[PDB]
Amino acid sequence: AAPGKPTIAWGNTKFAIVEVDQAATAYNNLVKVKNAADVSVSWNLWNGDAGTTAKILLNGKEAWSGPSTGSSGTANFKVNKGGRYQMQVALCNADGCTASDATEIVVADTDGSHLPPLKESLLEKNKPYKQNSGKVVGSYFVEAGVYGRNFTVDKIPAQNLTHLLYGFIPICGGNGINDSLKEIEGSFQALQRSCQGREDFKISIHDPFAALQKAQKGVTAWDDPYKGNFGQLMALKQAHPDLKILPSIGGWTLSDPFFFMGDKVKRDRFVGSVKEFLQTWKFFDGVDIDWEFPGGKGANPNLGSPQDGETYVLLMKELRAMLDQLSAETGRKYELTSAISAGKDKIDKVAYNVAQNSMDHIFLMSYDFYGAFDLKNLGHQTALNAPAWKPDTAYTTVNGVNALLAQGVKPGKIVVGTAMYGRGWTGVNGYQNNIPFTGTATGPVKGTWENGIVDYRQIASQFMSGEWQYTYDATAEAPYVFKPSTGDLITFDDARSVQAKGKYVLDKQLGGLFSWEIDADNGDILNSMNASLGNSAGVQ
């Protein structure tokens, strides 16, 4: 007759195709990619015949077989695909097979295929929206935001976005390569730690702990292979397959290395590391280049050259080729985008009309036009048009867009940016006609986390009452609050301004909208971004 029903023995049931050392500090010791996971299963049989053949079934599909030589046994086999499988041990003989009860084994992989959907409820003022406008709706999630700001991936209103850019991927490099970091507490030191033993100009992860080791909703088990933001983003892709999650390389303090990319030897090394990166972390849909201004004028005052414009176009070209190479190997489609300055002076230092042919989207940083970094010339930090008191204002959203359109850039590539934060000055004075922007400041305004910057959340919750004056400049399409006694002036985006930009995007037939760090919003900004772009409400 058929064999007796076997029983699965005690033993770890979680494995991974891509192993991650939950204790490593160096990127080169953090991950090791394997073509398949090494699984092992043992069983017992206290009653009945042991059969002649033993098989390991994964979801009913045979994954291993071998002679059944005793009432007990062990099977070692490979699993080349991630997922949660119902594993069974079956004993078989001439007349019949007998399977044991199912035991779940997890075979982890960086695409999150082993994780249950991370479908969290919208928080704060966030309201549901369907991405049915065909327009881009993106936002940035900062890696470091999981600390003080305590804003994790599970707090992201993922259903109200089409693109999600990661809080910046660094480029390895010490003195002379990433000096701009030295200005931030232990940041430079952190990067050297991650890049220990790694060639300079290669991609890396800035905060390994926050990225893959910190426990977070959905990935809290002490023995889960991928935790932190990455782990969560993997689960997030399971819930929102169509969501494009893109790693942004660069940023204000990590753009320094780009200025060396003129040397193709380094550029090739960079493009190669990015590819290996995309192969390693499958949840990512491409790459975002945030070279904080080619030509200088960035965080580092000693970098920038006329050669930068050409380098940028070359970089995008080579990256696009690399992604194409990758598509041929995975069959997937990858997006290539970039965040650029909205100022015409910087936009002209690059031939975007040519680079656009390799890029999917161009995220126009139409914000930070003004700020505490200049106490003499004040203005709207993210306005749409020039104000009435200075119609010849240079830094405005429209000018930025026009500059691009002028070069020959297709409007569909342009994604206008909105701010979920405000910039402000303190002790403003010497203004006339009651327009604070015409005076000068004595210093930066007290910020939420750092001087001169305040989350929209704090603006809407603390500076929308009391002695604060609220004003919406209809000419420029931008709001601002002012406290006469202390001279505190704050410029930011609000539902109305964002709505103005949305209709503007709809009119000029631009790509869409995106915002700087989703952690600073309470929902008003993103809600408006969606509504103004045509997305229908109600959960889908």
Side-chain angles (χ1 to χ4, degrees):
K5 177 173 189 167
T7 264
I8 289 173
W10 167 84
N12 168 53
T13 45
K14 301 163 66 178
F15 308 95
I17 296 173
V18 184
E19 310 187 309
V20 170
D21 180 347
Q22 287 292 309
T25 52
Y27 189 74
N28 277 1
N29 293 147
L30 189 70
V31 293
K32 170 197 172 189
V33 180
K34 293 153 64 179
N35 46 71
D38 297 294
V39 181
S40 183
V41 176
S42 291
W43 61 90
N44 302 290
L45 184 65
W46 306 99
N47 277 87
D49 197 289
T52 56
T53 300
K55 298 179 178 300
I56 296 297
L57 304 173
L58 296 180
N59 288 343
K61 155 266 180 174
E62 186 180 311
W64 180 95
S65 73
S68 185
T69 64
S71 69
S72 298
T74 294
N76 299 303
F77 60 96
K78 291 174 179 285
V79 182
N80 69 325
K81 188 163 177 293
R84 296 146 128 309
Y85 305 83
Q86 286 303 290
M87 184 286 286
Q88 291 178 296
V89 175
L91 294 181
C92 307
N93 61 23
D95 58 17
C97 286
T98 302
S100 67
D101 287 315
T103 285
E104 187 185 82
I105 65 148
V106 185
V107 184
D109 197 31
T110 66
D111 66 334
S113 57
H114 71 295
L115 289 167
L118 176 58
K119 214 171 189 59
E120 294 296 297
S121 285
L122 302 173
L123 306 162
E124 302 185 67
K125 299 184 171 54
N126 290 287
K127 290 292 185 297
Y129 279 94
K130 305 192 185 68
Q131 298 309 313
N132 60 340
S133 67
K135 296 297 182 182
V136 176
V137 182
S139 191
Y140 278 79
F141 170 90
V142 300
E143 173 167 282
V146 302
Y147 295 99
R149 295 172 163 71
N150 183 50
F151 193 95
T152 44
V153 178
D154 58 283
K155 294 184 177 182
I156 296 178
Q159 76 178 99
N160 296 341
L161 295 174
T162 63
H163 291 66
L164 180 59
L165 301 91
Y166 194 64
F168 307 124
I169 292 301
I171 296 169
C172 288
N175 298 323
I177 310 176
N178 275 299
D179 295 327
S180 297
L181 273 185
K182 296 178 183 175
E183 308 312 302
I184 298 178
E185 191 74 295
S187 189
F188 182 83
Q189 303 88 311
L191 182 59
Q192 306 311 302
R193 215 177 292 142
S194 296
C195 293
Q196 189 161 301
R198 196 170 172 64
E199 293 194 300
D200 296 321
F201 294 92
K202 267 183 170 178
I203 277 307
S204 183
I205 296 175
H206 202 172
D207 192 343
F209 180 71
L212 292 145
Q213 316 172 319
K214 198 168 189 301
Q216 303 290 5
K217 190 198 294 279
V219 288
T220 44
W222 70 277
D223 62 333
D224 287 320
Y226 323 127
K227 296 177 183 174
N229 310 325
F230 276 36
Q232 289 194 297
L233 287 169
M234 283 173 208
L236 195 66
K237 283 285 292 180
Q238 291 303 306
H240 306 287
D242 305 301
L243 178 58
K244 309 306 165 190
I245 299 176
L246 299 180
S248 304
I249 301 173
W252 186 250
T253 53
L254 289 176
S255 289
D256 281 15
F258 285 121
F259 299 107
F260 290 94
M261 231 91 275
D263 169 25
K264 186 158 168 60
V265 181
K266 297 181 183 62
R267 193 163 72 235
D268 294 340
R269 191 180 302 143
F270 173 72
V271 169
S273 73
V274 176
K275 181 183 184 182
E276 178 183 62
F277 187 86
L278 292 174
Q279 291 176 314
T280 295
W281 309 107
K282 305 181 173 189
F283 69 94
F284 284 125
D285 307 291
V287 60
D288 175 72
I289 302 298
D290 209 306
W291 177 354
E292 224 73 343
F293 326 140
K297 298 312 186 181
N300 195 316
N302 308 312
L303 295 180
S305 72
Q307 188 192 187
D308 300 340
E310 191 179 74
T311 297
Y312 180 103
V313 176
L314 282 175
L315 184 60
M316 301 297 94
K317 237 164 193 59
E318 284 149 41
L319 286 171
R320 184 60 265 182
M322 171 278 287
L323 291 171
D324 287 318
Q325 179 50 57
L326 193 62
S327 299
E329 312 167 316
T330 65
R332 298 167 57 194
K333 303 297 145 51
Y334 304 92
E335 292 207 340
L336 172 66
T337 69
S338 172
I340 68 170
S341 177
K344 180 172 162 57
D345 61 327
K346 296 177 179 59
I347 294 177
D348 291 320
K349 289 173 175 177
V350 181
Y352 286 114
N353 50 292
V354 179
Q356 80 177 308
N357 294 306
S358 310
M359 303 162 71
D360 295 72
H361 301 287
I362 298 172
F363 295 114
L364 184 76
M365 294 168 73
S366 46
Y367 46 69
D368 284 332
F369 293 135
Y370 290 82
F373 46 78
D374 187 331
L375 312 180
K376 290 184 179 181
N377 296 292
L378 318 187
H380 296 302
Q381 74 137 313
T382 185
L384 181 60
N385 307 296
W389 64 82
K390 182 173 177 57
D392 66 315
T393 298
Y395 277 28
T396 63
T397 304
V398 176
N399 288 334
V401 178
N402 290 325
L404 290 175
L405 289 171
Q407 269 179 36
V409 180
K410 273 157 284 189
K413 305 272 195 181
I414 312 175
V415 190
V416 173
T418 65
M420 303 182 140
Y421 62 99
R423 278 190 180 284
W425 305 270
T426 184
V428 174
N429 65 75
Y431 46 102
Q432 24 80 326
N433 301 312
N434 287 307
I435 298 299
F437 289 111
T438 61
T440 59
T442 74
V445 68
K446 176 163 150 48
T448 313
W449 312 97
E450 56 176 295
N451 302 313
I453 312 168
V454 290
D455 295 349
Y456 170 79
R457 175 185 297 107
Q458 183 176 53
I459 299 176
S461 118
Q462 295 178 183
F463 316 138
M464 298 290 237
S465 71
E467 197 203 324
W468 297 86
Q469 293 270 311
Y470 189 102
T471 299
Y472 183 81
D473 182 315
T475 304
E477 296 294 342
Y480 65 93
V481 290
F482 185 67
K483 195 172 189 174
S485 61
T486 57
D488 294 312
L489 172 63
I490 302 181
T491 168
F492 59 105
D493 251 330
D494 74 356
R496 186 165 174 185
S497 54
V498 172
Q499 187 173 59
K501 306 188 168 191
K503 188 181 181 302
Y504 172 57
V505 175
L506 284 179
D507 272 277
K508 302 302 171 177
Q509 303 173 64
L510 303 178
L513 301 170
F514 72 98
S515 52
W516 174 237
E517 56 183 311
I518 197 81
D519 63 275
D521 184 27
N522 66 9
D524 296 330
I525 308 306
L526 188 52
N527 281 337
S528 184
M529 290 171 72
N530 278 283
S532 63
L533 290 180
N535 294 330
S536 319
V539 194
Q540 65 164 59

